[PDB]
Amino acid sequence: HHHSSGRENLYFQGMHIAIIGAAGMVGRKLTQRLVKDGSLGGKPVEKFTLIDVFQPEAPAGFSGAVDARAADLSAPGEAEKLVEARPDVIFHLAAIVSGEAELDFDKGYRINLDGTRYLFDAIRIANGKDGYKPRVVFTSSIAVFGAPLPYPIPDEFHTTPLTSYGTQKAICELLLSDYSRRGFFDGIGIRLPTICIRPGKPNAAASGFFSNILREPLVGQEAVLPVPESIRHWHASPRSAVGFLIHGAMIDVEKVGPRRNLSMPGLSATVGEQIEALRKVAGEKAVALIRREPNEMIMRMCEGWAPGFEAKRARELGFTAESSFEEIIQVHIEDELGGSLK
Amino acid sequence: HHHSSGRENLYFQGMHIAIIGAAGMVGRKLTQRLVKDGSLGGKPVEKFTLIDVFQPEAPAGFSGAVDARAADLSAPGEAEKLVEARPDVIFHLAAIVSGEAELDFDKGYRINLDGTRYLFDAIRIANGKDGYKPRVVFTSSIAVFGAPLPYPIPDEFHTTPLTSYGTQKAICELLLSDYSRRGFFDGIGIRLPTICIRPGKPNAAASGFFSNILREPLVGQEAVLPVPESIRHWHASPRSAVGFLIHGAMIDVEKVGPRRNLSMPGLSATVGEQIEALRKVAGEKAVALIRREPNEMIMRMCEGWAPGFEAKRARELGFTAESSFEEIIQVHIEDELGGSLK
């Protein structure tokens, strides 16, 4: 045909998405969501570059270009190699976890700070060469905050982390805002809450109990509760975490303004409230699977875990998360357990 | 003699002080004060290592060891060379100024961030080798803050700098707290206010007028005022700036706690208030030397200059500064003009 009466295409030109830390729980779920959605929001996903220290799997049901490989962003030339592929959106999710960063000073700074700096500089240099200006969505963390902390923590509260991991994230945030301001890329920092319920198997992190006391009982398994019911912490589901990333990739950076690092919404809840939600949703017999076995070493660490945030700016900007533990538990049942406890 | 009835020595063993940025206005005045005092507070100063990109002068009236040389902390091996000399106290004052850092992305990050990181890592490595654990007093800046800012700015207000210089300082602050926590050195970050009155000659920085409109009239010279009287900014004298450094070198780090970066006291004042102080102290004829010549480019920048701070923690910890512009002007007359306008 010859006659058109206005815009015709559903879609713009396709886009290339890169995910660093693609083999982690968040990265895999992000990849899966992007495949399912097909586009972001009006650009079809034409290619994934998927990088992690552990080999990422090519996503099932995706028919576009895939470059999935095991690589360390901190290693010589790797940042440049990614940037030469000119991805339109870069999700930077990779980090060595706090427990590891605390025990290995060098490794944490190398992977969590230097690797990020190398990526940011490779982008900067390409921006200078040919105007390359990608969307960069970086996962920061509530670990950027350190005690003493008010409850709730306001948007303007300073970052005084008491871990090297939190320090590394806080520095990456500052670099992200400065490079964004100077126009090298369009950066958005996403400060993830604790992910609850974390799917899979009990991870040895002192804080694993926040998920263990729900995840295991929901499948008829026992779990240890090492702390008292009054302990208060700040949470969002894996679904929500992924939602933050999708939203951050498309948000108008002019609405965000120069303060590009955002405290995400989530839920402040006590351990007692988690258990009551488990009782309501899964029943007395599930709650009965929780073994109260005090551990004074974990209890001492509760002081340094953030109680909760106002998240005012992020909510105004359209980020959303769960508002009850019943919701968190429902998300887990729907997303991990096939919608049924049988 | 043979009999002692208690402690006898005024002084402990001598100490070695290093000053990086020693040839700058603050560094030279710091050196001079330390020579005059003779000790800190009970350790005689036995040696100065004085380093700056411009050759520092050996201080007059000092009889101890002097190692004064032109060097760049960011250059290969320089950080290690300083640390091999094992100074007891390190005053890290060096930086390329914001105007330069903004126009030269690479140079600012190299000198203001990387050089500091190299120093901190050289100390860390020595701490691992032989327990070397110096006092490190770092000059940060109110440049770590960026608009929109409340007046006054509370101690817990986040660092969202809108310059690369402020970004570099904010990152150095975070590194300083983390290395201090991990026990590599005893770090204290000193966030300097604007120095007023800055001695010498009009510096071309857009903000030079804050000093120019007092300094020049006090010696019968004209000065341009490019902004309206309502403009509000946050100031301390050179004497006070030096006082912060002396205090920071000796303060009990346990009283400071893990948040090692401190907003200094100072004075919030309008331009009108500066002029009224000049009128009171120097008279109508001095005020008459100020030429009101609006400059819309400087005026636009006033928005991004910090109005004033609470400085609650720093005042509780014994840091002090001027509380009126009459005091600031009196300090300038005493310290720069021989106590007299003739």
PDB file of C-alpha atoms in Angstrom, chain A residues 204-316:
ATOM      1  CA  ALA A 204      25.093 -18.650  55.179  1.00  0.00           C
ATOM      2  CA  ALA A 205      24.907 -14.838  55.538  1.00  0.00           C
ATOM      3  CA  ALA A 206      24.025 -13.971  59.169  1.00  0.00           C
ATOM      4  CA  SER A 207      20.859 -12.328  57.850  1.00  0.00           C
ATOM      5  CA  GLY A 208      19.658 -15.424  55.909  1.00  0.00           C
ATOM      6  CA  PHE A 209      17.094 -16.151  58.637  1.00  0.00           C
ATOM      7  CA  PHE A 210      14.864 -13.307  57.384  1.00  0.00           C
ATOM      8  CA  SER A 211      14.085 -15.533  54.360  1.00  0.00           C
ATOM      9  CA  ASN A 212      14.754 -18.963  55.941  1.00  0.00           C
ATOM     10  CA  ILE A 213      11.934 -18.617  58.515  1.00  0.00           C
ATOM     11  CA  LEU A 214       9.423 -18.234  55.663  1.00  0.00           C
ATOM     12  CA  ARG A 215      10.908 -20.165  52.723  1.00  0.00           C
ATOM     13  CA  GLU A 216      11.526 -23.470  54.550  1.00  0.00           C
ATOM     14  CA  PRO A 217       8.240 -23.629  56.519  1.00  0.00           C
ATOM     15  CA  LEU A 218       6.289 -22.967  53.285  1.00  0.00           C
ATOM     16  CA  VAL A 219       7.721 -26.262  51.941  1.00  0.00           C
ATOM     17  CA  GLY A 220       7.287 -28.170  55.248  1.00  0.00           C
ATOM     18  CA  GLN A 221      10.920 -27.749  56.349  1.00  0.00           C
ATOM     19  CA  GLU A 222      12.288 -26.448  59.648  1.00  0.00           C
ATOM     20  CA  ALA A 223      14.102 -23.156  60.074  1.00  0.00           C
ATOM     21  CA  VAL A 224      16.017 -21.503  62.864  1.00  0.00           C
ATOM     22  CA  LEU A 225      15.059 -18.110  64.258  1.00  0.00           C
ATOM     23  CA  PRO A 226      18.217 -16.771  66.040  1.00  0.00           C
ATOM     24  CA  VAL A 227      16.818 -13.369  67.122  1.00  0.00           C
ATOM     25  CA  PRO A 228      13.833 -11.921  69.063  1.00  0.00           C
ATOM     26  CA  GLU A 229      10.491 -10.946  67.454  1.00  0.00           C
ATOM     27  CA  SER A 230      11.004  -7.185  67.872  1.00  0.00           C
ATOM     28  CA  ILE A 231      13.876  -7.098  65.330  1.00  0.00           C
ATOM     29  CA  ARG A 232      12.886  -4.679  62.536  1.00  0.00           C
ATOM     30  CA  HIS A 233      14.225  -4.749  58.933  1.00  0.00           C
ATOM     31  CA  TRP A 234      13.480  -3.445  55.399  1.00  0.00           C
ATOM     32  CA  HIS A 235      12.432  -5.783  52.597  1.00  0.00           C
ATOM     33  CA  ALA A 236      11.170  -6.237  49.010  1.00  0.00           C
ATOM     34  CA  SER A 237      10.375  -9.341  46.924  1.00  0.00           C
ATOM     35  CA  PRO A 238      12.466 -10.552  43.964  1.00  0.00           C
ATOM     36  CA  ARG A 239       9.528  -9.461  41.711  1.00  0.00           C
ATOM     37  CA  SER A 240       9.778  -5.938  43.154  1.00  0.00           C
ATOM     38  CA  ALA A 241      13.572  -5.859  42.812  1.00  0.00           C
ATOM     39  CA  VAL A 242      13.198  -6.718  39.113  1.00  0.00           C
ATOM     40  CA  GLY A 243      10.374  -4.141  38.796  1.00  0.00           C
ATOM     41  CA  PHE A 244      12.744  -1.448  40.150  1.00  0.00           C
ATOM     42  CA  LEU A 245      15.239  -2.267  37.411  1.00  0.00           C
ATOM     43  CA  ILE A 246      12.674  -2.191  34.585  1.00  0.00           C
ATOM     44  CA  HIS A 247      11.321   1.107  35.915  1.00  0.00           C
ATOM     45  CA  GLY A 248      14.816   2.614  36.357  1.00  0.00           C
ATOM     46  CA  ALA A 249      15.733   1.735  32.760  1.00  0.00           C
ATOM     47  CA  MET A 250      12.861   3.809  31.334  1.00  0.00           C
ATOM     48  CA  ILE A 251      12.337   6.636  33.846  1.00  0.00           C
ATOM     49  CA  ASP A 252      12.727  10.221  32.636  1.00  0.00           C
ATOM     50  CA  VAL A 253      16.114  11.266  34.047  1.00  0.00           C
ATOM     51  CA  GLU A 254      14.952  14.897  34.021  1.00  0.00           C
ATOM     52  CA  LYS A 255      12.215  13.941  36.532  1.00  0.00           C
ATOM     53  CA  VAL A 256      14.823  12.242  38.708  1.00  0.00           C
ATOM     54  CA  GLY A 257      17.200  15.219  38.472  1.00  0.00           C
ATOM     55  CA  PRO A 258      20.926  15.175  39.365  1.00  0.00           C
ATOM     56  CA  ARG A 259      20.494  13.085  42.546  1.00  0.00           C
ATOM     57  CA  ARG A 260      20.453   9.857  40.557  1.00  0.00           C
ATOM     58  CA  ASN A 261      20.704   7.401  43.505  1.00  0.00           C
ATOM     59  CA  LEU A 262      17.309   6.479  44.877  1.00  0.00           C
ATOM     60  CA  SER A 263      16.189   4.752  48.067  1.00  0.00           C
ATOM     61  CA  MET A 264      13.703   2.132  46.846  1.00  0.00           C
ATOM     62  CA  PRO A 265      10.328   1.558  48.452  1.00  0.00           C
ATOM     63  CA  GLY A 266       9.794  -1.654  50.364  1.00  0.00           C
ATOM     64  CA  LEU A 267       8.346  -2.749  53.663  1.00  0.00           C
ATOM     65  CA  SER A 268       9.567  -2.203  57.211  1.00  0.00           C
ATOM     66  CA  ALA A 269       8.495  -5.201  59.312  1.00  0.00           C
ATOM     67  CA  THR A 270       9.355  -6.876  62.565  1.00  0.00           C
ATOM     68  CA  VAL A 271      10.183 -10.574  62.791  1.00  0.00           C
ATOM     69  CA  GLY A 272       6.946 -10.949  64.803  1.00  0.00           C
ATOM     70  CA  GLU A 273       5.027  -9.447  61.863  1.00  0.00           C
ATOM     71  CA  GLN A 274       6.701 -11.884  59.413  1.00  0.00           C
ATOM     72  CA  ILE A 275       5.601 -14.813  61.596  1.00  0.00           C
ATOM     73  CA  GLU A 276       2.047 -13.514  61.986  1.00  0.00           C
ATOM     74  CA  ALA A 277       1.853 -13.208  58.156  1.00  0.00           C
ATOM     75  CA  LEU A 278       3.089 -16.815  57.883  1.00  0.00           C
ATOM     76  CA  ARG A 279       0.428 -17.879  60.375  1.00  0.00           C
ATOM     77  CA  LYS A 280      -2.326 -16.085  58.404  1.00  0.00           C
ATOM     78  CA  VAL A 281      -1.222 -17.381  54.983  1.00  0.00           C
ATOM     79  CA  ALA A 282       0.219 -20.834  55.718  1.00  0.00           C
ATOM     80  CA  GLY A 283      -1.232 -21.691  59.154  1.00  0.00           C
ATOM     81  CA  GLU A 284      -0.145 -22.794  62.634  1.00  0.00           C
ATOM     82  CA  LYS A 285       1.655 -25.896  61.415  1.00  0.00           C
ATOM     83  CA  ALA A 286       3.995 -23.742  59.253  1.00  0.00           C
ATOM     84  CA  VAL A 287       4.778 -21.444  62.172  1.00  0.00           C
ATOM     85  CA  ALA A 288       5.464 -24.583  64.257  1.00  0.00           C
ATOM     86  CA  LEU A 289       8.388 -25.393  61.919  1.00  0.00           C
ATOM     87  CA  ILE A 290      10.299 -22.322  63.185  1.00  0.00           C
ATOM     88  CA  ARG A 291      12.792 -23.255  65.921  1.00  0.00           C
ATOM     89  CA  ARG A 292      13.675 -20.374  68.232  1.00  0.00           C
ATOM     90  CA  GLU A 293      17.376 -20.910  68.907  1.00  0.00           C
ATOM     91  CA  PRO A 294      19.029 -17.683  70.101  1.00  0.00           C
ATOM     92  CA  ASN A 295      22.373 -16.754  68.570  1.00  0.00           C
ATOM     93  CA  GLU A 296      23.939 -13.745  70.304  1.00  0.00           C
ATOM     94  CA  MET A 297      26.367 -13.131  67.434  1.00  0.00           C
ATOM     95  CA  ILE A 298      23.566 -12.588  64.900  1.00  0.00           C
ATOM     96  CA  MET A 299      21.608 -10.564  67.489  1.00  0.00           C
ATOM     97  CA  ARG A 300      24.518  -8.143  67.904  1.00  0.00           C
ATOM     98  CA  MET A 301      24.480  -7.627  64.112  1.00  0.00           C
ATOM     99  CA  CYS A 302      20.775  -6.695  64.020  1.00  0.00           C
ATOM    100  CA  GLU A 303      21.728  -3.234  65.316  1.00  0.00           C
ATOM    101  CA  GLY A 304      23.581  -2.545  62.077  1.00  0.00           C
ATOM    102  CA  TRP A 305      20.749  -3.597  59.767  1.00  0.00           C
ATOM    103  CA  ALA A 306      18.562  -0.730  58.473  1.00  0.00           C
ATOM    104  CA  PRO A 307      15.076  -0.535  60.029  1.00  0.00           C
ATOM    105  CA  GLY A 308      13.143   1.139  57.197  1.00  0.00           C
ATOM    106  CA  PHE A 309      13.007   4.067  54.793  1.00  0.00           C
ATOM    107  CA  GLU A 310      10.606   6.838  53.858  1.00  0.00           C
ATOM    108  CA  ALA A 311      11.360   6.276  50.127  1.00  0.00           C
ATOM    109  CA  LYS A 312       9.396   9.450  49.295  1.00  0.00           C
ATOM    110  CA  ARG A 313      11.145  10.466  46.052  1.00  0.00           C
ATOM    111  CA  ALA A 314      11.091   6.898  44.652  1.00  0.00           C
ATOM    112  CA  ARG A 315       7.367   6.499  45.342  1.00  0.00           C
ATOM    113  CA  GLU A 316       6.651   9.903  43.768  1.00  0.00           C
TER     114      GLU A 316
END
